[PDB]
Design a binder for this molecule. Sequence first.
Ligand SMILES: N[C@@H](Cc1c[nH]c2cc(Cl)ccc12)C(=O)O
Length: 522
Amino acid sequence: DNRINRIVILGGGTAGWMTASYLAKALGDTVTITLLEARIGVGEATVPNLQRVFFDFLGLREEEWMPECNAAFKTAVKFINWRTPGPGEAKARTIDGRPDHFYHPFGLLPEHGQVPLSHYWAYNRAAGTTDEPFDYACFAETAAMDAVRAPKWLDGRPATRYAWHFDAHLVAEFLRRHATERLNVEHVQGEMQQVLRDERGFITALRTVEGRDLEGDLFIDCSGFRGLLINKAMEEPFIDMNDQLLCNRAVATAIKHDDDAHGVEPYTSAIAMRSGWSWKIPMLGRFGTGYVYSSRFAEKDEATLDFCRMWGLDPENTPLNQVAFRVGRNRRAWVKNCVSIGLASCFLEPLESTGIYFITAAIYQLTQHFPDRTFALALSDAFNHEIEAMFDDTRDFIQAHFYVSPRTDTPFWKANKDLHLPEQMREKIAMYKAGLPINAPVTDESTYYGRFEAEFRNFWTNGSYYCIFAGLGLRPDNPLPMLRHRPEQVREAQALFAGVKDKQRELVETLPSNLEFLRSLH
Ligand SMILES: N[C@@H](Cc1c[nH]c2cc(Cl)ccc12)C(=O)O
């Protein structure tokens, strides 16, 4: 009889209550779970697997949890002004007669002859028979997002792959209620006084300021950047990676919005600024927004003013959150009987909406490597490996946004070009320039989005590397050389571009607006 009997979670934000709800659902009566928890809602974005991996596991359909979190729909991230120089402004600048924006949608690109559609687009660009941007030629979603359409028809009929925007505080409160009312999680409202440890350094109990000992065999650190368990009690070092990603501050708020004027944008915006980038996370009646910048290149006051100026805000009569970030990850996410999840584990700037995903993935991987009271080292070693590889792969992917961007107009954008590029990312850029696919998907969407392990082993597929590289203006030196030996396959593949064009008109003309669906839902 060596199985875990008691779990104690420190921290009651999004990570704490996603951890409490999922583990309580997975373990049932076999374990007692106790959570001990002691400002402006600026919005948060997600990835499609959140419904399949997390909410479906809890039995919660979007029709129930979305109205409780003022949730809205996300079809992509839209990158604005990442190729052109100038001020931090909300509207895209013009380049080659086109707006300077590009999309990074979800889903998998179709193939012909087992070659991704991306490579036939690069073929036609090299041939000079088209000048259409990659995202508008290969993604039907681009048209629907420009027409601010919903990702679904009003009666639930799906149309395009999508994720969610929501208020993270409202999500934690919803899950707090669900866990304590339906899953028998004990909520303890108090502060932690001290961490009780045994001879081997394992945590035995959390002691509250009221003097109560929360006894447990397994402890989850969801205390945010504080890392009260993993960093302070367990003394596990944090690996600062701000040398590779320069942004370390944000100034943020939420802005009321008249949705009847131009609708609700069904995508997160990442707006390039002089010393960083600004997010925009739209919801019903309001949008969250924050300027992520580097303190090495911008003063706090100028970032604040640049941020307020973009949105026409009075800087002296606007509620603002001023936050400093911890960019990097712990050397190990799981040490002895202490598992860090969320900001206590790692953090990247939300350029590609990895925050909620890193929690979901850590929760899932914990159940996959769940221990007993012997705490076999292979379980936590394997867990730490998957978490480390997940973070480092996305970290490098994020850096390539700034590295491949052609902007050199401010010290921030130029300095990104002087940073060391990791060898694996250099290899990928070289393969992309030689015409090769990068991390091409080998399954259809149903397997990819049906099995979390499928996506986890290939999270940034070829479509995503093309979305960013081609969106930033980087194009291969030549098309895939095999394509010049298969002219008939090139001729046949063009039907796919017509299929995208057909779907583009169909969705724009028959889909409801994002605003209409949100008002039907809320
Ligand atoms: N597994 C994710 C990968 C992904 C593809 N496009 C995006 C865009 C953003 Cl902001 C995050 C993540 C992704 C998925 O395909 O859903």
